[PDB]
Amino acid sequence: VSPPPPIADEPLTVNTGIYLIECYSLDDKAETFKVNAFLSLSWKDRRLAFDPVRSGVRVKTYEPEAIWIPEIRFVNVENARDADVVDISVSPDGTVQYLERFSARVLSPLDFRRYPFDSQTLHIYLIVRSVDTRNIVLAVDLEKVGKNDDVFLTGWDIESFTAVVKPANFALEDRLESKLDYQLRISRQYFSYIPNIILPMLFILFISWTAFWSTSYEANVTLVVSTLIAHIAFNILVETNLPKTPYMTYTGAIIFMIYLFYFVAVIEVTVQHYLKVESQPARAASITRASRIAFPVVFLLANIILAFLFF
Amino acid sequence: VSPPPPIADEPLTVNTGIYLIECYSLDDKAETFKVNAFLSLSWKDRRLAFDPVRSGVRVKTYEPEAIWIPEIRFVNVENARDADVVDISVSPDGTVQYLERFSARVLSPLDFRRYPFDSQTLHIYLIVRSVDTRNIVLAVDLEKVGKNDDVFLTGWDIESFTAVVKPANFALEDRLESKLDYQLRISRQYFSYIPNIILPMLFILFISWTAFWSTSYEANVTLVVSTLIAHIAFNILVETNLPKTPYMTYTGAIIFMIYLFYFVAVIEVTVQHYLKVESQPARAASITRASRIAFPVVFLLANIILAFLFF
Amino acid sequence: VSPPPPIADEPLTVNTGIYLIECYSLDDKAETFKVNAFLSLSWKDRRLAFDPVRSGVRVKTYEPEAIWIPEIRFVNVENARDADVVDISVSPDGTVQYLERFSARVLSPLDFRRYPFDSQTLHIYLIVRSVDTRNIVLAVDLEKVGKNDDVFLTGWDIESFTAVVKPANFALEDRLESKLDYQLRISRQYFSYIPNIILPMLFILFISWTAFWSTSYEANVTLVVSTLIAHIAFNILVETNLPKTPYMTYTGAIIFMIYLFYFVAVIEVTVQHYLKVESQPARAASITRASRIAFPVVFLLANIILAFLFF
Amino acid sequence: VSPPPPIADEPLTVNTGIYLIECYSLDDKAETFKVNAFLSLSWKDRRLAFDPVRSGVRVKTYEPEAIWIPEIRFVNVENARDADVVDISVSPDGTVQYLERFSARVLSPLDFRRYPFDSQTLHIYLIVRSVDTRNIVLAVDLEKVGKNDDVFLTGWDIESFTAVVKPANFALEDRLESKLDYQLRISRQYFSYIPNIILPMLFILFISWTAFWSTSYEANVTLVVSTLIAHIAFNILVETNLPKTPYMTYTGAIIFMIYLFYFVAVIEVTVQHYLKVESQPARAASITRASRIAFPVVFLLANIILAFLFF
Amino acid sequence: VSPPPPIADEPLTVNTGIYLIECYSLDDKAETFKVNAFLSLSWKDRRLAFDPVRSGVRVKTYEPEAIWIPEIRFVNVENARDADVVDISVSPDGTVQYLERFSARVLSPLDFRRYPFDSQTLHIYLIVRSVDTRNIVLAVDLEKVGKNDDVFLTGWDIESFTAVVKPANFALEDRLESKLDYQLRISRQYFSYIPNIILPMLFILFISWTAFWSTSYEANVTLVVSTLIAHIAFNILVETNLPKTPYMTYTGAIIFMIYLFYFVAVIEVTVQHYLKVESQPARAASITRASRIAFPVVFLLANIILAFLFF
Ligand SMILES: [Cl-]
Ligand SMILES: [Cl-]
Ligand SMILES: [Cl-]
Ligand SMILES: [Cl-]
Ligand SMILES: [Cl-]
Ligand SMILES: [Cl-]
Ligand SMILES: [Cl-]
Ligand code: NA
Ligand code: NA
Ligand code: NA
Ligand code: NA
Ligand code: NA
Ligand code: NA
């Protein structure tokens, strides 16, 4: 078996199409996702053409080893896809119609800057290395690109599955390569983050602020220190569901900013006590009374600034 | 090897049957379940007809590669099933009786709204793609569909294993497809949740309410703060055994509601102190005395409302 | 290849034997165990008989594909066993002696009611499906059933490896089936549970009871609350090494019972304070003096009751 | 293919040799370790002997399927080794020189009595089963047993790789077996345990002892209770890196012993307070002054006793 | 198939080249990394040479089994690489051009001394064992060595991918071996460590130092003890992302040093109280006033010393 010969000096166009059957296991830390899909390929081989009159059949079914099949690979995969050939069908003119059902772990990097209010564009890169005889160029058959209705990705909303129709052909090791881009747009389901992380994290912060309505230093220390410990637990729980990013995330910004409010609340609680012991509770009272308004106002403005910068 | 030819213009009916041997590893986070079962297939291939007078044997046994076997696949699987052919038996009329024992991790979505007092309907989807020569339609052989008595799923009660007899015949990529639905009904064993999560989480809440029978603000802060920290541990322990859902779960609702009771208890504990220091313990006493009745009544009614909304 | 023909109308007896080489990875949560053992099979095939005086050779060695071998499978396995044929030897009369070394993950349910003072009976179920020509029945060759001396299972004491000699012959999908039961009796090594869980869990409880020799409510709150937090940590550490059972475990019972002692200690600590503030420390003293005797006595009796109920 | 015939009535000696290429993943909980090594085998087969004069070659290279190769297996392995044949070479006298590169997960039990100041002897057991024709005996070719210099095992110091030259010949299932022992001596790198576990665990204990220079019961309760909670965290952190042993470990002994010092410190702290309230601070002072000397002396002596018993 | 014969007595030079497609999963604890790359091989086989004028063809394509291919292996791999042959092309003179796309988990040790401000040199070792007929020597074809622009390693900056052109030729088990070194230089992205570990760990330390501006021993105990517990949580969180090293890491040094500051702060807090009770608050005040300057100065200098020693 060898590639079909060119009629003139034109490259062989292999029409592609991916139809997603099952979408699952999106690892945020590993920036991977597992896919189960159909792969449809179509090319013209004149050597396989026949007259439907003499042959007595309008279509001929072949085994993979019997005829020449182009070496189609995925760029961003962990290991080689678990392919299983469904059907190979030849038309009288010699147009081969290949179909296989595969499963692979895809390496698609994620952008956590707006986490957990982020949207992602997952990529599937189809590639073909040109042979010495003739060059192979990929094309998108929009009729054979899709996803079924039951495709669900846990914790994500599947927006669309499209393909960049124009391939990005390039030279690699003195041979041509045709690359295609299959984009799967998704958006995070941030609902669970509100009652599990955001709201309990805010309650522990407001509970620490009840120290501006107390003169008991021993109770204030317990209030601001204990709630800080709960924030450390929340900061740890968050950084376990996320990878180490060289940029600041939206949640990461808020979490880090809250570590300063706890630090300033400790300073205020110490100042109030030092002034009380120094027999000047008039200054201690005015600082405490100011903090009652300062802390919520600065916190609310700081969040408006952050949310503005991130969105 | 090619498909059997039609006597008239009828599609080939492949009679199916799944018999569950072992049911294991139900992942709640991944919404998967591993199954070890028998798969029985039956189709008429007249091309395999024989005379037992001549051949010597009443029933003929073939190897999988020897004869044509229909390409039966599962829709909702992670990877291709680990199949092992048990027996292929052809009768003189050509009726093939296929039997294989497989193992696959099935992708069946779960509903955690009533967790841990929820019931699920797990699905197994058999599918067959029609060939160019003739169409293939699936059928259920109710005699060969079941599960053995020893089938146990850890933490679950296995109700039934049935099949939707009428197949879903639909067009996919210009070819006909026959889909079958194998439903496995299960219900959760909620017993362990009561002494491990529900009751210890209630004890820590009632312990916080002993602050309504105390005038010691420093002891009250320790009481309401420390028990809130224990409740954060309980909220974390629960959200680790569950996936991030875009809906509110029953336990998630209760856990979140308890966060408000700790927040209001902190306000009461602060109010009582502020009034005591302001030299008006008559107001502080009446608020504290009211909270002794208010907190248990509101909590009891709020739970009746939630349980009503969820069930 | 086809099954040996019956001399009369008797079923083919396949003599079995499992010899455990390596026993490892007992997962308590998954109720699985990995095994590496020898499997010996023996049946009579007259078609393979030869004259000992003529042939010269006493025994004939065959390849697996050359001769007919019965399809022996395991019922309670995750996936198909990793078998490797060691030797196939035929006697002059036609008795075949098969030997293979396998490795499989076995699904054997566990009983945690007496945990960590529990004993288990692990099962290995051999099964054979009868063919259309003749029926196949399993038998135990007690000479070829065993385990080597070096077989160690981490955290467990291996008692015995026996087989239920009488097979379970039953009908499944219109064909006969012969099932064998290989039982491996083990008992847990509870030594590590005493200094790591039981004794530290008792020390934290007795430390909470030092609040019956204190009048300082602020110190008593710290004592009873802080120790409860440590007990929650132990309750969590325990439920992570165990699966969700629909029954009460022995440790689970003790752990849950201790939650009540903390709850009553909190009530006593609150009562003592309420009476002190109410200017009647005579009642507060008598309640505190009684609890010094009540708490250890009730705890000691409650444990005798539990241990009695469980053992 | 069949085994070489004996010249007299001598058993076939297969000369072995393992050369470790890569040593990795020593699981302490699972008592396993992965290996990547060369396996060299050598036996005399007269049936393959040739004259180098007429052949015109000093050596002859064969494929594995072409000639008879002895079935060499490993006793203590999880699954069958991932073998890849490097070279098969035959000398004119018929001496076969086999070489393969394998990878296997070895089951070698560990002794944690002196942990983390322990040394281990890892085992690799080569085994050969004798055939009906003639018996097979293993031998060590010390020239072909080694390990490369770059062999590193994370957290361990690799001492030596030697083999017990005399094989253990024994009967198993009516057939003779030749077993060889390849011992890999290693010793733990205990450096990381000192600043991460030992020293931080000692600091928290000495911090608890500052309660012998304080009369504030509320502060002493906070001191001894809080530090005990940190010790529980250290006790848990340690038991997660170790399997459940039916013996006491060196670290396990120290950790458990410290639990008693925390218990006696709580008793002393309670005694001091009870005596203070009972208006006899002269007794309370003498007990507190004694504990300042008693606690460090008893702790220092108790450690000398333990270290002596363990080493 | 056998190796090409030497024209004189020269060894066969196999020109190599690795082109990295995907770089992923760098395990710090396991000191491993998964790669997906192209492997290009080139050698001269005169037995395959042909005339380009009469043959009409300039290049001839062969199957792997058709022609002799050198046994190229990787030294530092877990298991054998998942290779898939892309193309085999022969030139008129007999120069073979092999290309395969592989995936393997590489064992490359890491240096954590400057963690998380460390840089690593990952290694890939190509090796070839010489045959009895002739010796095989490796060479680097710098034209076919590279990495694509999209190669991303989570949490790391990929500097370069180069190869040590001169191979290490050495004797192993009486046969010659040729080894090549492919070095992949990377540097850690330390950005995430600052707001998640470094800065929160510093805030809790400075919060403990507010005890130098307080006379309340009960509040000082709460301050220094509670913050130390948070530091233990940070020490644990760090030692989980790192393997047990026989050397001191930069973070490990800082974390351990901070343990001493908490220990000295506890001593100061005890000294201040003992002097206050001893009715000499003039000495207690001067010690407390000195510690206000001492603790930040000593900490700042100690860090300059450490950073100097490590960098
Ligand atoms: Cl691929
Ligand atoms: Cl280009
Ligand atoms: Cl090109
Ligand atoms: Cl399937
Ligand atoms: Cl099996
Ligand atoms: Cl093996
Ligand atoms: Cl390799
Ligand atoms: Na082909
Ligand atoms: Na077939
Ligand atoms: Na306190
Ligand atoms: Na057979
Ligand atoms: Na052989
Ligand atoms: Na070859």
- How many C-alpha atoms does D6 have within 13 Å on its Cβ side? 12
The amino acid sitting at C284 is A
Find the largest Cα–Cα distance for chain B.
113
Q: Cα of D143 to ligand 13 centre, how many Å? A: 30
d(Cα B80, Cα B93) in Å, to the nearest integer? 32
d(Cα B96, Cα B110) in Å, to the nearest integer? 37
d(Cα D90, Cα D88) in Å, to the nearest integer? 7
Per DSSP, the three-state class of A135 is coil
d(Cα D16, Cα D144) in Å, to the nearest integer? 8
C-alpha pair distances (Å), E60 with each of A71, A173, B124, E97: 18, 18, 49, 10
d(Cα A61, Cα A53) in Å, to the nearest integer? 17
d(Cα E177, Cα A265) in Å, to the nearest integer? 68
* Residue-wise DSSP of D52-108: HHHH--S-EE--TTTS----EEESSBSS----EEEEEEE-TT-EEEEEEEEEEEEE-
Q: Cα of E80 to ligand 5 centre, how many Å? A: 27
Residue found by looking up tokens 């709630």 in the block: A227
Protein fold of D193-311: Methane Monooxygenase Hydroxylase; Chain G, domain 1 (1.20.58)
**Positive/negative CA dihedral, E275, E277, E280, E284:** positive
d(Cα A214, Cα E219) in Å, to the nearest integer? 15
Written in H, E and C, the secondary structure of E8-25 is CCCCEEEEECEEEEEEEE
Distance in Å, alpha carbon of E94 to nearest chain D alpha carbon: 24
For D203, the closest chain E residue by CA position comes to E263
Tell me the ligand closest to A65's alpha carbon.
8
d(Cα B95, Cα C144) in Å, to the nearest integer? 41
Residue found by looking up tokens 């960049």 in the block: A164
Q: Which residues have CB under 8 Å from A202's CB, separation 6+?
A: none
Helical H runs in B100-151? none
Q: Which residues have CB under 8 Å from B179's CB, separation 6+?
A: B75, B125, B126, B127, B138, B167, B168, B169, B170
Q: Quick check: B49 and B39 in contact, CB under 8 A?
A: no
Q: Which two tokens stand for residue D31?
A: 């008592």
Among residues E249, E244, E251, E253, the alpha carbon closest in space to that of E29 is found at E244
Of A75, A173, A270, the CB nearest to E213: A270
How many of the other CB atoms lie within 10 Å of CB of A295? 20
Q: Cα of B76 to ligand 4 centre, how many Å? A: 8
Q: Which two tokens stand for residue A289?
A: 């009374």
d(Cα D45, Cα D67) in Å, to the nearest integer? 10
Which residues have CB atoms below 5 A from the ion given as ligand 7?
E 73-74, 77, 80-81
In the complex, which subunits touch A with 3 or more CB pairs below 8 angstroms?
Answer: B, E
Distance in Å, alpha carbon of E173 to nearest chain A alpha carbon: 34
d(Cα B162, Cα B143) in Å, to the nearest integer? 11
E230–A232 CB contact, under 8 Å: yes
d(Cα C105, Cα C95) in Å, to the nearest integer? 31
Residue found by looking up tokens 């002493």 in the block: D220
Q: Quick check: C121 and C185 in contact, CB under 8 A?
A: yes
Question: Which residues of chain E neighbour A247 with C-beta distances below 8 Å?
Answer: 191
E210–A270 CB contact, under 8 Å: yes
D129–C87 CB contact, under 8 Å: yes
Q: Which two tokens stand for residue A274?
A: 């030092």
Residue found by looking up tokens 């190669």 in the block: E151
SS3 helix, strand, coil % of chain E, rounded to 5?
35, 35, 30
Q: Which two tokens stand for residue B13?
A: 């009916």
Q: Give A124's strand partners.
A: A182
C-alpha pair distances (Å), E108 with each of A243, B114, E79, E185: 22, 49, 14, 12
Q: Cα of A197 to ligand 10 centre, how many Å? A: 26
Phi, psi at D274, each rounded to 5°: -55, -40
- Experimental method reported for this structure: X-ray
Q: Which two tokens stand for residue D242?
A: 């170790």
d(Cα E153, Cα E131) in Å, to the nearest integer? 38
E222–A217 CB contact, under 8 Å: no
- How many C-alpha atoms does C284 have within 13 Å on its Cβ side? 19
Question: Which residues of chain C neighbour D172 with C-beta distances below 8 Å?
Answer: 19
Question: Which residues of chain C neighbour D228 with C-beta distances below 8 Å?
Answer: 204, 207, 230
D274–C206 CB contact, under 8 Å: no
Q: Which two tokens stand for residue E85?
A: 């042959």
**Positive/negative CA dihedral, C215, C218, C220, C223:** negative
d(Cα A62, Cα C83) in Å, to the nearest integer? 35
Q: Which two tokens stand for residue C237?
A: 């550490």
Q: Which residues have CB under 8 Å from C192's CB, separation 6+?
A: C155, D239, D244, D245, D246
Q: Give A125's strand partners.
A: A181
d(Cα E19, Cα A173) in Å, to the nearest integer? 9
Q: Which two tokens stand for residue C175?
A: 């064909």
Q: Where are the domains of chain B?
A: 1-192, 193-311
Per DSSP, the three-state class of C123 is strand
Q: Give C100's strand partners.
A: C39, C85
The amino acid sitting at B269 is V
* Residue-wise DSSP of C221-272: HHHHHHHHHHHHHHHHHHHHSS---SS--HHHHHHHHHHHHHHHHHHHHHHH
State CA A1 to chain mean position distance: 40
Tell me the ligand closest to A45's alpha carbon.
8
Q: Which residues have CB under 8 Å from A260's CB, separation 6+?
A: none
Strands laid side by side in the E72-74 sheet: E72-74, E119-129, E175-188, E156-172
Of D217, D226, D228, the CB nearest to C216: D217
- Tell me: cis bond preceding D116? Omega within 30 of 0 counts: yes
Q: Give D124's strand partners.
A: D182
Phi, psi at E50, each rounded to 5°: -150, 165
d(Cα A60, Cα A62) in Å, to the nearest integer? 7
- Tell me: cis bond preceding A64? Omega within 30 of 0 counts: no
d(Cα C93, Cα B44) in Å, to the nearest integer? 41
C-alpha pair distances (Å), D280 with each of B197, D271, D277, D284: 46, 11, 8, 7
d(Cα E77, Cα D24) in Å, to the nearest integer? 10
In the complex, which subunits touch E with 3 or more CB pairs below 8 angstroms?
Answer: A, D
Strand residue runs (E) in chain E: 12-16, 18-27, 32-44, 60-61, 72-74, 84-90, 95-107, 119-129, 136-140, 146-147, 156-172, 175-188
Residue found by looking up tokens 């299932």 in the block: D173
- Tell me: cis bond preceding E116? Omega within 30 of 0 counts: yes
The amino acid sitting at E172 is L
Q: Give D61's strand partners.
A: D89
Q: Which residues have CB under 8 Å from A113's CB, separation 6+?
A: A247, A248, A249, A250, A310
d(Cα B168, Cα A150) in Å, to the nearest integer? 14
Q: Quick check: B198 and B255 in contact, CB under 8 A?
A: no
Q: What architecture is domain C1-192?
A: Distorted Sandwich (2.70)
For E253, the closest chain D residue by CA position comes to D195
* Residue-wise DSSP of C40-99: EEEEE-GGG---HHHH--S-EE--TTTS----EEESSBSS----EEEEEEE-TT-EEEEE
Distance in Å, alpha carbon of C126 to nearest chain B alpha carbon: 13
Question: Which residues of chain D neighbour E229 with C-beta distances below 8 Å?
Answer: 226, 229-230
Of C221, C262, C267, the CB nearest to B223: C221
What does DSSP assign to residue C7?
S
**Testing the interface with C: which of D71, D123, D221 to mutate, by most C Cβ within 10 A?**
D221
Which residues have CB atoms below 5 A from the ion given as ligand 11?
C 1, 69
